[PDB]
Each structure stands twice: as structure tokens, then as C-alpha cells.
Amino acid sequence: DKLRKVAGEIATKYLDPFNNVYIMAITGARGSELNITQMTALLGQQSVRGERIRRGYRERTLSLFKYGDIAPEARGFVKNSFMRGLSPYEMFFHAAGGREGLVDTAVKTSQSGYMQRR
Amino acid sequence: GVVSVEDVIRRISEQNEDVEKYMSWSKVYLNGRLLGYYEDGKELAKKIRESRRQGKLSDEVNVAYIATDYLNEVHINCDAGRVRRPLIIVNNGTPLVDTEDIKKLKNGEITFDDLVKQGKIEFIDAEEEENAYVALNPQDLTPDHTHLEIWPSAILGIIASIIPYPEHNQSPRNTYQSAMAKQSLGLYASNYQIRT
Amino acid sequence: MLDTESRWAIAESFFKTRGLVRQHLDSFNDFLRNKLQQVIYEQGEIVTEVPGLKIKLGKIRYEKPSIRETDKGPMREITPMEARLRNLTYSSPIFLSMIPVENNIEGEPIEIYIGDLPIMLKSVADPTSNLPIDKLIEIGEDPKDPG
Amino acid sequence: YETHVLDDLMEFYEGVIGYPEIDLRLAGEEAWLKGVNPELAEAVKKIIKTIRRYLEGSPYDGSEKPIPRYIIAEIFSQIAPEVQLLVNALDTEGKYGFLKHIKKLNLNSLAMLSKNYN
Amino acid sequence: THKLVDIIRLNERLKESIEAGAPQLIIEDLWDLLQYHVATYFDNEIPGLPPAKHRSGRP
Amino acid sequence: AKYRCGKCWKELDDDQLKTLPGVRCPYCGYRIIYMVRKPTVKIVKAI
Amino acid sequence: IIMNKSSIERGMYRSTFFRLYSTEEVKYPGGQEDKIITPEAGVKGYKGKDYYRLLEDNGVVSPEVEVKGGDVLIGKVSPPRFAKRDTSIVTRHGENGIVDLVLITETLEGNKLVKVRVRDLRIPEIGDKFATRHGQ
Amino acid sequence: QVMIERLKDSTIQISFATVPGRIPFAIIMRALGFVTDRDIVYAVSLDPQIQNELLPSLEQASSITSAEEALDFIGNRVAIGQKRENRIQKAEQVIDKYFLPHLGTSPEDRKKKGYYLASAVNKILELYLGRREPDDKDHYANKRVRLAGDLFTSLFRVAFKAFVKDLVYQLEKSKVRGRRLSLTALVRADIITERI
Amino acid sequence: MIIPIRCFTCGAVVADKWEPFSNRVMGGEDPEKVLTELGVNRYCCRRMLLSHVNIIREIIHYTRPI
Ligand SMILES: [Zn+2]
Ligand SMILES: [Zn+2]
């Protein structure tokens, strides 16, 4: 997390003082600092259900890595921004991280409706 | 050389033998059913894999060796319904498919089926891929590696391969594209006029 | 050191020899070639309450796709486009060669029509799978549909 | 001997015997009837077909728990014409006395324990 | 309407059994069937009791 | 009420005055016929 | 999004929507009882003489005619199950289009099957939904 | 579906669809052909540390010494109120045809089925001792995909069973009444044609 | 299906340039030079000529009897 924050700060510092994306972000017009970091510096750690990507083979989140590997790159850490492009396993980990919202919104709608009716 | 479970039990009971001799042996399962015991799982798994690659055994047989510190087993699967994918076999850090094979493919002398029959490329299931070590690219290949990927971007489907530069997008964007690309208008068939 | 083009050659060969929809065709071909007789054999025999009478099921076969135009028609063959237009079922007949046992005699085997089964498009059952492009155009089928 | 089958129906109607037991006894008596008269055999086949259609996968299914009275009344309503035909086939003074008054009752809605799924 | 006509005709059958000097036990069985039909007419889906089903099998 | 035999593309033509069992054209045994465009001028504005 | 209307007027994203209405002249038990396809004169349930203006003599609408609102495409009369009744096809009230194709066949059981395909031209407008290959 | 459970006490209870309640492990093992606890223990595993967890189950089935005691113990649950011979027969049919039919429904294969059951119990103990983690329902080594082939052959199986049932009915009616011996007029083919 | 009469962006006729461009590109000439010397310099027309499918050639086989 500290690595991602530092990389985002570096990218912002080396970035142009007044860009259209920067103007959108700073003015509050459909932007955020995290979006700038992920589009420019790096994606960062991709966590599913609040933890690193663990699902997969035994002691491996993916068959591309060695047995019992706990290196950051192995378990859902992406060092590549969207401008640079994601590696295949990095893209797989990003998809695994982003899978949750697709169902969380659907369950949240019904639960909120039921509670509000009550 | 797999010794049946009933034979093993008989030769421990009917004949006086060391139980610890057979405790260190590797269990051998077939389609989830305990088939027997073997000296070592790795050797039997390698024998089955080589027999399948040489064409003696059927290509639908997938063998895996667990070798957990607590327990070691050999799992052999030949049932239907297993989702299996093809990988280039890599031996001693060099893939079995060579320049001559690629030249023949480009000329058209041999096809993908000829490649898999020759033993260069093999289809593996999840259980067999448990003990496989794969490399995305030939420059990532090491002698420790066991397999190579035919196409690094083949992890996608029919629609996810429609997107240009999909690795620069966010995953929800690609998912929504896949969802809404089925609704797009176009020519669904060349014979749409006669069809009803 | 296989470059991008070398690996794409393998991928293109895969997609060329093996179609986009191969799991369905493979499963249906496995069913037709093996499972059709496997069901008959696992049935085994037809035994009735009366002891002398018995039926043995010998072999099963599927004919080319056809329809019964009349009550006792010769089962003329049809094309999938005709099945689409006339709301027909693109199905093929099944003849099962069962030999009758009466008073514990085998007699002579006879094959009887037991029903029509729908067949997958572009499989071993239908004739359009191996037709050329021009023949596909002539019959009225899109040359590019995977079945 | 139609005396045995009518006594069997009386015993089943009194609830002293469960469903598998009565099914087995009617199967044996249907074999006897098929030996004697095919029409009695097909009547018994219809009666057991109705019974199995009602009493298939029942919560008791021959358990010590007695069959509910409404189920027995309804099934004997449904099999009433067949029972009358069986009585007409062979007349017994003691046996037919109980079945002389039971009549067919047509019902639009039925209490079938078994459903289309099972 | 279907449940009501079933109830009416089964009540008529019970009356015919009563007036014909039928045995007591068959009368009690018909009474139980009538009470079940009524208790299905009100609140078909009641636990511990099989719901009445149409000829097509739908509840 | 003219018709067209569907064999190949626009196989000849048929008239309703022709009477056959079922629906068939006299020329061939094909079972499918189509109604032809009515011989009237149609005004189609080019938007 | 904003779309160039001049491009739309040149056929940028113009499309056509085809709808199919099909019926079978089903025969049910009785004495030569069939639901003959024919234009209707005075039978019950009659929609109105204006709705049958474009229906041909044989009872099915001719191709390449404008169909508006609830115009009838196939004229069918049905004898009662328990005296003719109108089961003729009414084009959907919202949908307006031109008859594209008319097809007549014989079903396996021997009933007359008639299919009418109607095409409708859709020019892009305000409110039409467009999407790119990325999820926008 | 057969469900094997381990209670708070180390007893193991085995149950399945037709038999109400939970059958003890050693009882059902003895019903399948096992004669003494030593064979059951050695069939479960060969490690004494994992073998020691079967003793409470064995002594819960201590009263059951012969196979017939297990058989009528099961038959009491399967169907109650009939004679001992009928109970034994009913238990025999339900055990042969409703326990593990993929292994086989014949009485000859019954012994084989018992071995399978023991292996299953072994895994539970391996889970209890801490040797193995629970199986993942999401792992593709555990998930199979049925295409048109398997489904459509099951559909043909049920259609052919119905067709043979109707053919047997019609043939027996014709024989008891006396009619044509030819099967061409008794085909009733549509029983399949419509059903599929 | 059939090449549009006019470029969608700018109302410039590109239909008459389909046959020469397609014939010369199929002959073995790079599309850039053929487009440049044919008389289309705006890339809005180039995408019209470059990205065309000519479905009408296949459809004439499968034509509605009407
Ligand atoms: Zn013709
Ligand atoms: Zn232009």
C-alpha cells in the first residue's frame, strides 16, 4: 500500500501542472487521485474479499507461478498502469479483484429496498 | 505395476509383512476410486504421461501426483466433462515444437491434430495442471518449466477477444462490453431474407 | 524461441481444423457412435411376464434425415432450410434390429422403426456437414454457420 | 379366488397394513388373476396404478404411521368403478356387502401426494 | 369454482351415504374428505396437508 | 392471386386458379410457394 | 453521445426490424371441420370493414403494402369448440411497417401454414442506444 | 447421494436417501460382506494413528457380529412391520440398487462397494486429523460440464425405458388375448419421437 | 452490404471509387498510394473505402422470392 501511494505521488509530481484529466480530478469533475494513480503510476494490490488473491491450485494462485510462492507479483499485485498495459496474469488478477461489485450491487439493492419498506 | 488394495491387505494379513513398508507407498486413485498402491507417485505419473504422449495410451487420460507432506496420492481421470486446455510440452527448457514443425504448419503439411498426435502439444485438465509449471513466453522459459502457452491471449472468450487493447481498460468495462455486444445490430446471417 | 507469428500459426490451425463449436459436436458424435448402442446394451433384453416370449435387442442404426410426407410415404430426405420454413423437426429415423423369441426360438432378426431423433447441425448425422460451399449455397444454407 | 382380493382391499381400507405391503399382496393376487382371468388382472393393474400414483414417495410409505382417512376415501373413490367391476366378476355375500354402497365420485381437484416432478 | 363444485357434489355424496344407511366408518371417511376439501378451499397452502392439484397437476 | 414456386430462386409462377391437392406447383414437387408483389405502383418517399 | 444528423440522413446507422406472424390451419375432430383461411364477411367478432382493405382474395395480405396499426394480415375463421369466430391476425397496435414476405406451406399433419414477415425502417434518433467495443 | 458424517464422539454415521436415520459405519460395512473389525480397519487405512479413530464406531457395532445382523438392522429402518426374511430381502435390494450403483447393482460387486466406502471414511479421518484441507467446490478438478451428449443420451435412456414398458404391456396383452406375432404393428414409435 | 453512395461524415461520393480501389488493391498494390492517387485524402472517406465488406455479393444468392 505504501508502495502504491508513493508511486502515485511520483506520477502526480512528474505530471503536467494543469492537464485535462488533472483539471477533472482536482475540481471534483468526475475524477479522483486513485484514478490518476491507476491510470498513470500503477494499479496496485488487487484484493478479493479484503485479502490477496488466494484461490487456485494448491499453494499457487495460478499455474504460472512456482509452488508455494508468496511474492507480491504472484498474489494479485499489478505493477503496471492502464497506460502501460497489464500482463496476462495481472489482467486475470484485476478481473478477479473486480468481480465482487457485479453481485454486491444486486444484493445491496434488494436488501436496501426491504429495509426501507420495513 | 499397481498393487490392488485387496491384494495389499491380503499380503499384510495372510503373509507377515511390514506395515510401514506399505505406509510409505503412494496411493493410486482412478476416477476418484481407490485403485491401489505404487512404489512412488512421480515415476508412475511420468510413465502414464509418456505412454499417453507416445500414443500407446488414450489422450483422454490425465494423471496427477499430489505429494503433500502429510499424504501422497496419484489421481487418474478419464471421465467426460473435464474442461482441458492445450499446452506446448517443454523438455529441458526447450519446447517440443520446433522450427520444422512451424514450417510444416505454415506450408500446411501438418495441422494441430498432427501436433497433438505427435506428442508435441498435450491437453491437460485442472488436476494435471496442479503439478504443471507454465511459462507465458519462450523468453520466460527455464529448465524448471514443464509447459508453454500456445496463445497468451487465449484466456479470453469469443467476445472478450473483440475488444481492442483490452488490458488498458478496467475489468467492469470489459464485462459490460461482453454483456452489450450481443445486443448490437448487424448481419446475423447471409441468408436472412429466406429465413423466417 | 517461437515468435508471435509462429504461435498464431498453431492457434489458427486449432481454430481451422477444430471449429468454434466443437464441444457440442464432439459430445453428439460420441453419443451417436457409442452411447446409442450403449443404452440398448445396458437395457440388455426385453423380458415379459409370460415365460416363453422374449425379445433380444441386436443393433441400432440412424438413417439420413427425412420426414413422412404421407401415411406410408418413402421418407424422402429434406434440407435444414426446409425444416426451418415448414416448422418441421430436422430429425432422423431410428431402426432397431430386435429379434423376436417365441416359444424359445430365435427366428429371423427384424429391424423396426422406433422413432425420430433430432440431430445436431454440422455433425456426423446430417449430410450438410461435409458439403462444399457451392452446394451449401445451392441448398440454401449459410456457408459460415458453425452448426 | 376373488374372496382373497376383496379381503385384501378390506384390510387395506382398515389401515392395518401399509402401502408396500398392500402393493406386494396385490401384485401376487394379480399374478393369480392373470392365471385365472385377464380382465381381473387388468382391473388390479389399474387399482395398483391409481394407488401408486397417489401413494408414491409418501411421508409414511408403509411406516407405522397410519394412512390419513381422507386419502383412503379419495383413492377408494377413484378406484370405485374398478372395484364394482371386480365385485361383479365374482360375487361374495360377506365381501361385497361393504363394497355394495361405495360409489364413484368425480373430483376436479385431487390430493395427490406425488406430483409431476416426482 | 372448481373447488366449490367439488365440495358441493361431495357433500351430496355424503348426504346420499347418510340417507342410504351406509356403514359408519365410510361415512366418517367421507366426512374427513369433505372437511379436507373445505380446509383446502380456505388456505390451500397449509403445512402438514397435501394441496389439492388440478388435472394438469398445477396447484 | 399469383404465386411463385420457391425452388431455387423465383421458379416460374403460379395462379390461384390452378387446383392441386395440398399446396404444390405443377412444375415440381416442392411444397413451398410465395405470394408475388402486386402489380401496382408504390410511392416510396426518399425520406 | 451526440450524433451527426447529416450522417444519419446518409444512412449512417439506419436499420430494419423484421417481425413474423404465422398461423396453421389446424384441423380438429369433427365432420370435415377446418379453419379455412378466407376474408371475412359477416361473422361474429368482426373487427370492421376498414381493417380488411389490404387483405387479398385468398385471405393473406400481398407483399410490399403499408401496414398500419391493427390491420389484418391473414384472414382466418374458426368453428366453435363448444357460428364462425374471428381468429384473424391483427398487426400489433404500436408496430407500423411494410409487408416484406409471404410464405405458404403444408405442415406434416396436412394443415396449411402461412407466414407473413413485416419490415420496419428504424432511423437513429434521440434516445437510441449506442455502445462502443469497450463498455461505453 | 450418500452422506457420511462424524459426530462429536468419534462415531461415524452413514446415511442415504431411501433409508431413514443414520446407519453406523461398521454395521453397513458388515452388511456389505465384511466379517470382522480387522478387515474394516485395514480397509479404511494402513496408518495406526488414523486407524485408532474407528474403535468407537466398531464398538457401537459390536453387537452386530454377522452380516445378517447388519442386514436386518438396516431392514428395520428401510421397512418396518414385515417378517425377518422380508426385512432381510428389502435391505438386500436397497443396499444393492440404492447405495452406490455406479460401482454396480449386482450382489457380486457388493464387496467392491464396501472397499469404496472405507476409502471415503479414510478421507474424513484425514480431514479430522488435519492432514488435508476441505475440497474446493470451485476447483475444476471437482466440477464437470455436461454437453448435449450426456444429457441427450440420458433423455434417450428414459425414452427407451418408457418405450420398452409400453411394448411389454402391449405384447403381454396381445399374448394373453391372442393376436399377430409380428412386432411391426406393435411398434408405437411416437413414444420416443414426441418425448425427445 | 453495398457501398454507400456518399461518405457519412462529408457528403462526398465514394461509391464510384469502390471498383477501382478494390480492383487495384486486390491486384497487389498498397492501399495508401491507391487511395492517395484515386482522389480521397480525408481519412473519413478512407475509412469508408477501407472498411467495407460487400455483403451484397453473397446476398444475391439468398434473395427473397417476393
Ligand atoms: Zn416449381
Ligand atoms: Zn468523407
Side-chain angles (χ1 to χ4, degrees), chain F residues 5-7 11 25 27-28 30:
Chain F
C5 192
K7 197 71 174 181
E11 179 215 10
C25 69
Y27 320 126
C28 59
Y30 194 20

Side-chain angles (χ1 to χ4, degrees), chain B residues 57-76:
Chain B
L57 198 49
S58 190
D59 56 7
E60 307 271 323
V61 170
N62 280 180
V63 60
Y65 175 50
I66 307 306
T68 300
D69 53 307
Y70 275 112
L71 60 87
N72 58 4
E73 322 175 281
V74 167
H75 291 269
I76 316 169

Side-chain angles (χ1 to χ4, degrees), chain C residues 67 69-70 73-86:
Chain C
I67 55 165
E69 301 263 351
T70 49
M75 278 274 188
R76 57 169 296 267
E77 307 173 2
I78 64 167
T79 181
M81 205 58 236
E82 176 161 350
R84 283 163 178 141
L85 290 180
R86 301 177 55 184

Side-chain angles (χ1 to χ4, degrees), chain H residues 1-129:
Chain H
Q1 169 190 342
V2 174
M3 192 188 338
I4 316 171
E5 271 146 0
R6 186 196 178 283
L7 271 53
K8 284 282 211 143
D9 46 352
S10 179
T11 184
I12 294 170
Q13 295 297 289
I14 295 167
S15 56
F16 63 94
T18 186
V19 173
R22 303 210 210 89
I23 297 169
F25 161 67
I27 284 184
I28 181 67
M29 287 300 289
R30 295 195 203 274
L32 292 167
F34 284 50
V35 190
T36 174
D37 48 2
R38 211 210 73 260
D39 301 278
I40 319 172
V41 163
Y42 264 50
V44 165
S45 179
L46 290 181
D47 182 74
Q49 164 210 24
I50 191 167
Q51 279 177 351
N52 290 318
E53 273 68 14
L54 308 165
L55 309 183
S57 314
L58 297 181
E59 83 202 355
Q60 184 178 2
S62 69
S63 174
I64 304 298
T65 66
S66 184
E68 294 81 5
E69 277 276 292
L71 273 177
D72 63 358
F73 182 76
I74 300 172
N76 290 318
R77 298 174 174 270
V78 180
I80 180 63
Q82 68 270 9
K83 296 183 290 294
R84 174 171 177 176
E85 279 283 351
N86 310 352
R87 278 181 296 175
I88 279 181
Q89 290 197 358
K90 183 52 177 295
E92 178 264 351
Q93 293 105 20
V94 298
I95 287 307
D96 291 331
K97 175 242 191 173
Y98 273 10
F99 187 60
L100 287 175
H102 75 263
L103 290 156
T105 61
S106 176
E108 312 296 310
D109 297 350
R110 188 153 47 195
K111 189 65 178 299
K112 173 194 307 177
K113 307 168 68 165
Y115 273 118
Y116 190 99
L117 183 63
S119 75
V121 161
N122 181 22
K123 284 174 52 66
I124 292 176
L125 299 174
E126 302 216 60
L127 176 58
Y128 157 78
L129 291 192

Side-chain angles (χ1 to χ4, degrees), chain D residues 101, chain E residues 12-23 26-27 30:
Chain D
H101 47 89
Chain E
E12 182 40 36
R13 177 60 200 115
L14 179 57
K15 189 268 198 195
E16 294 170 10
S17 284
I18 286 286
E19 301 315 349
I26 188 169
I27 287 179
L30 280 177

Side-chain angles (χ1 to χ4, degrees), chain H residues 27-28 31 109 138 143 157 180 184:
Chain H
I27 284 184
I28 181 67
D109 297 350
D138 291 331
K143 299 166 77 175
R157 176 176 294 112
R180 186 81 176 99
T184 77

Side-chain angles (χ1 to χ4, degrees), chain B residues 101-161:
Chain B
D101 304 325
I102 304 306
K103 292 182 59 181
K104 295 182 182 304
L105 277 168
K106 293 176 176 175
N107 289 31
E109 173 176 352
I110 58 149
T111 61
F112 185 84
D113 298 5
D114 289 2
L115 276 174
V116 306
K117 271 135 61 163
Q118 280 180 10
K120 311 294 188 57
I121 298 174
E122 72 163 342
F123 283 82
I124 63 174
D125 193 9
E127 194 78 270
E128 179 167 354
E129 198 164 351
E130 284 262 3
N131 51 47
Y133 186 52
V134 176
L136 280 167
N137 316 293
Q139 65 262 16
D140 291 331
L141 209 59
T142 66
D144 193 350
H145 280 89
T146 309
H147 282 95
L148 186 80
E149 301 218 300
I150 297 169
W151 199 228
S153 61
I155 64 180
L156 302 182
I158 285 297
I159 308 284
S161 51

Side-chain angles (χ1 to χ4, degrees), chain B residues 6 8-9 12-13 19 22-23 27 32-34 37 70-71 73 77 79-83 125-127 130, chain H residues 38 42-48 103 115-116 119 122 126 130-132 139-141 143-146 150:
Chain B
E6 80 178 284
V8 166
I9 297 169
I12 308 145
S13 297
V19 65
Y22 286 75
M23 282 192 30
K27 300 175 176 294
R33 172 176 60 92
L34 179 52
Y37 286 78
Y70 275 112
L71 60 87
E73 322 175 281
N77 291 354
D79 62 23
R82 294 169 299 121
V83 186
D125 193 9
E127 194 78 270
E130 284 262 3
Chain H
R38 211 210 73 260
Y42 264 50
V44 165
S45 179
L46 290 181
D47 182 74
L103 290 156
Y115 273 118
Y116 190 99
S119 75
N122 181 22
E126 302 216 60
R131 302 187 175 186
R132 56 158 70 238
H139 206 288
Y140 273 60
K143 299 166 77 175
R144 305 283 182 271
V145 179
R146 313 272 158 231
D150 292 296

